[PDB]
Assembly symmetry: D2
Homo-oligomer: 300 residues x 4
């Protein structure tokens, strides 16, 4: 069977195992540095299988050797201090897991997302197409959710593309969002759409402020699981993913959220959308912020 | 209790619709037909597949309209794969089924689609929003399939809207189709897209020419079942369906394929697209043809 | 649409919302006394809907008025002191939610399960068939999981019935467990089967010891969600549920885990299995322990 | 890449099997038939239903065996709904398909089932564990359906094992059927159970008598698709299937319906039930009949 290793069995990691288990895509290995945590969550989820009817081997471990020969490696072990702390963790996870699964596609979740994905590429030495980051699917999901709510339509009929990174680094593109092929601008007035775009930018913080302790995990995990499925089933999904750029949108040597075709080979194509002056202004300012974070990381 | 769906006409499309619905576990299914044994056999066969698929659906076959009473949704797939023959079949089906399920949403499938839906509305006397026809979901599905195949992307990421009726009456709208929010024109060039539009127009005939002895049913049934689901779960799906127009697109007193929000109340909203002059030219010509068929019906 | 209210948006409650949301059974209301917690988890899960493709209205609240007219009420707000603390919480939740949803089926999860279900029946005044407790489905799930693992077969082909309550109160019945209709005893030797039965009894504690902080939730939530689905779809599931007895197995005026047919009417039938001398010895000792807990509760 | 499933014979059972499998999103599906247009039409029709159902499955139709190369699973549903006609059809199908997919697990559906599976084993020369036949899953499904209907419980909670072949060759085993681990005898009395056993024996004929012009396909296809899934996902399902026996139940050199653990390796284990003398009497008589058909084949 296919093999998926999730490094970091916290809220996002365990929830990702939950979403994946129900899909019955393959074996799942939950790894963490804390003893008992992954073993307990994995066994708990495994014991729910007879009820849900899925046949999935879900195991927990503290030994990287158990992640060997994985088809996909999901990294959810993350916690300038933020960059340093996460850089050290990401470094540790990738330097230990990558060598054991040379043919795997690595999907980063740790924040700062774009920067941590860049670091994972460096440490793993994997072809850039096989090291990607999850950020855009979650952000587009919030946007799509708000649009469906406001427009009064099924979430299954709303599509949307966006780029960049989190919050201020986010590059919203309402022009590239539709409901059953019809522009979203036809359903929602400019003023309200602007509010929705703003709510999207602050989407992660909105959850953090409500939970008081901890950040979002159901949607982030769902986003991550969808990307894992895309690779495993070679589905050719068109989605915004953190990818390594070599000229697209005028950006070079940097991980940035862009539209891609995701399949068995990881990033199989980076789409280059013809953005107008206003949208490019947004992307340039975003790339500036992402670049700044990337530089801070390189100076560590 | 559970929701109740009655499928009138247990042929290829009707039986296949029962198959798609059963797997969805949306509620009881009653397959009715004028031919004895046929609906009973297909219904029992499908029911016997339930322990394998793990779904709890009571699917039964019958020749008695009394068994369709109090249905939440009535699907009509009894037509013969022309206006006269189907007009009589449709009137007979609706006249017997409608009175027994006064709160049901009727989904017409019989061809000529737009015209038969109009007839069902007349005979049933049901509020217009609760009498609709399936046509556009199937045609948009063929279009989306071709786009997905050509672009090399998941069908889950392709969406499209179109209007009108079948074949020459279809009103393609490539401008209103996207892949994850991105215009299809970004993936497929003009000439190739035009070929896909043409293949979509001839989509039904393409399957007919291949099967030789009948018409399509897997996709037509899937489309029909998706509309049934939209109603039963009040999903508010945005899809092209045959609806009664009262001024939209400049059309009155006519059933025509238009974008709608489909839910428990049936057509809960008819969307008004900002069609350009080229697209409007196609729509007007289509309406003229649909109008012609309607006149012949009256 | 159907309406499900989950009282107590903690690990079990939020996870139950997750399992239910994917089933697309109806609207879900997550309620908690803590501000922000339910609103955050509900919104997080709602934002995952466009990714998973399900249309489910998931909302969080601190106002019981938002649970009015629910089809099913799930209680997962629980924390002699244990009985008292949980008795007070259960009392508060039921006395406030029951009056607002007079036609709902109440499914208790709070521990001590059997006793808390009994209390919910008293406080709600609902017909006993409409007040049940989840315990047996989870326990049978662990048992079935261990059997599938050992026998080397799909979890979809293992069935098992058991009675009583948790741990020492559990009444295992290997004789009433099969794989595609074949007795489990045909696949697993007596010594090993005994170990599996023992592992089942300690199943909850095994997870607690691994997690160190907190108890199981994936399987408990799955068990709860399966019971909710049984009521909403009037599925007539045959499962062990905490029900009110009036003579079955020689027990009267007590909630105890027994085999039932679960549907729209809640408990539609309490099956009376012909247990042998050995099994009855187990059930009597269990009923003694459950009774003791029930008495402690009545003396509060 | 994806898994590849080839279905030889695009008739009712074959096309319906493609339908069940497509919804499962297990891998590519190739529908092959000797009749031109038929497989192509059904495959394209089903493919066009994918954007509606939201599944990514490449389903294609063909008349060329070359398109079935390197399949993980080969389903054979080409037989005519007797030994001679199907023996020739089966030999032709296996002789052409087997060499192109040397690592595939062959699942026979053609009747006479046990005999045709034996023939497929001979012609393919494949390890016996990788050549099996579908028969028991369907019969057990009918039985489980009747039990569920009679007991008033979910089909998800009913499980049962049976052996042998079709109709008079079937070896019912009510003793080995339960509802959530509880013996069926606890819910249904002896006489009623006997009636259900008889209805199960005649289950196939019951559908035939109703349809009038053909045999069952929804449940037969579901059963076949479930076996395909078991192999592709190495699910280790415990089910009755036609397997090659080397001493089990005292039977040698014969294909017979027996309980097995079905996975990626095909039959990964043949279970040996502790049958009493009554049940063994039924099995011996059944084996005698299956043996008779086998002799006629040789
Ligand atoms: N990209 C997105 O869209 C997105 C969305 C949400 C959260 N995130 C990020 O994902 C990360 C995880 O969030 P969370 O809420 O699940 O956190 P968490 O604290 O619940 O879980 C992280 C887990 O990682 C484990 N861990 C730490 N160091 C490790 C190491 N070296 N190896 C293996 N395991 C290790 C911890 O012990 C812990 O169980 C954070 O960086 C967070 O900011 C990203
Ligand atoms: N709108 C679309 O997108 C679309 C797509 C495909 C087919 N169709 C149309 O759907 C209809 C059915 O196609 P089919 O391939 O399933 O046909 P079919 O001939 O296989 O089945 C029709 C069934 O209707 C039954 N029937 C006839 N009169 C009846 C009556 N008065 N009451 C009850 N049952 C009656 C027949 O006995 C038959 O079993 C045709 O009109 C066809 O053109 C529409
Ligand atoms: N029956 C079983 O098989 C089973 C299995 C596991 C856990 N449980 C039990 O389920 C309960 C919940 O476990 P958990 O891990 O989810 O706990 P938890 O502490 O994570 O969550 C309980 C939630 O209830 C809320 N709460 C407290 N008082 C409340 C009130 N009056 N009204 C509304 N909300 C209130 C809390 O604020 C908290 O968010 C416990 O009693 C536990 O022992 C039962
Ligand atoms: N084992 C079971 O439980 C079970 C249940 C039902 C039916 N069956 C059997 O399955 C078979 C198919 O039943 P059906 O109803 O689908 O029949 P059908 O007649 O509808 O379809 C058979 C298809 O096989 C094709 N075919 C014939 N020779 C071929 C060859 N050499 N190569 C490729 N394709 C060829 C035909 O052209 C036809 O489309 C029959 O033998 C039937 O008795 C078995
Ligand atoms: Cl960054
Ligand atoms: Cl028309
Ligand atoms: Cl108790
Ligand atoms: Cl035979
Ligand atoms: Na999926
Ligand atoms: Na068919
Ligand atoms: Na079908
Ligand atoms: Na279910």
């Amino acid at each position: 069977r296919k093999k998926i290793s999730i490094i970091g069995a916290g809220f996002v990691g365990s929830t990702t195992a939950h979403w994946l288990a129900a899909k019955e895509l393959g074996d799942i290995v939950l790894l963490d540095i804390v003893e008992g945590v992954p073993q307990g969550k994995a066994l708990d989820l495994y014991e729910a299988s007879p009820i849900e009817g899925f046949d999935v081997r879900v195991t927990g471990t503290n030994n990287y050797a158990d992640t060997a020969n994985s088809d996909v490696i999901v990294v959810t072990s993350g916690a300038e201090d933020l960059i340093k702390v996460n850089a050290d963790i990401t470094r540790a996870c990738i330097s230990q897991a990558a060598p054991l699964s040379p043919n795997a596609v690595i999907i980063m979740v740790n924040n700062p997302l774009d920067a941590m994905t860049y670091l994972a590429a460096e440490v793993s030495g994997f072809p850039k197409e096989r090291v990607i980051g999850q950020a855009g699917v979650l952000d587009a999901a919030r946007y799509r959710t708000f649009i469906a709510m406001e427009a009064g339509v099924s979430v299954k009929d709303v599509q949307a593309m966006l780029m960049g990174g989190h919050g201020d680094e986010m590059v919203p593109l309402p022009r590239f969002s539709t409901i059953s092929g019809i522009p979203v601008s036809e359903f929602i007035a400019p003023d309200r759409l602007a509010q929705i775009v703003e709510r999207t930018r602050k989407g992660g913080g909105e959850i953090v402020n409500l939970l008081k302790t901890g950040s979002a995990y159901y949607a982030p995990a769902a986003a991550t699981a969808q990307m894992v499925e895309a690779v495993l089933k070679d589905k050719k999904r068109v989605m915004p993913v953190a990818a390594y750029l070599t000229g697209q949108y005028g950006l070079n040597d940097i991980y940035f959220g862009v539209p891609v075709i995701l399949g068995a080979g990881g990033v199989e194509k980076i789409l280059e959308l013809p953005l107008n002056e206003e949208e490019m202004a947004l992307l340039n300012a975003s790339a500036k912020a992402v670049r700044a974070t990337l530089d801070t990381l390189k100076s560590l």
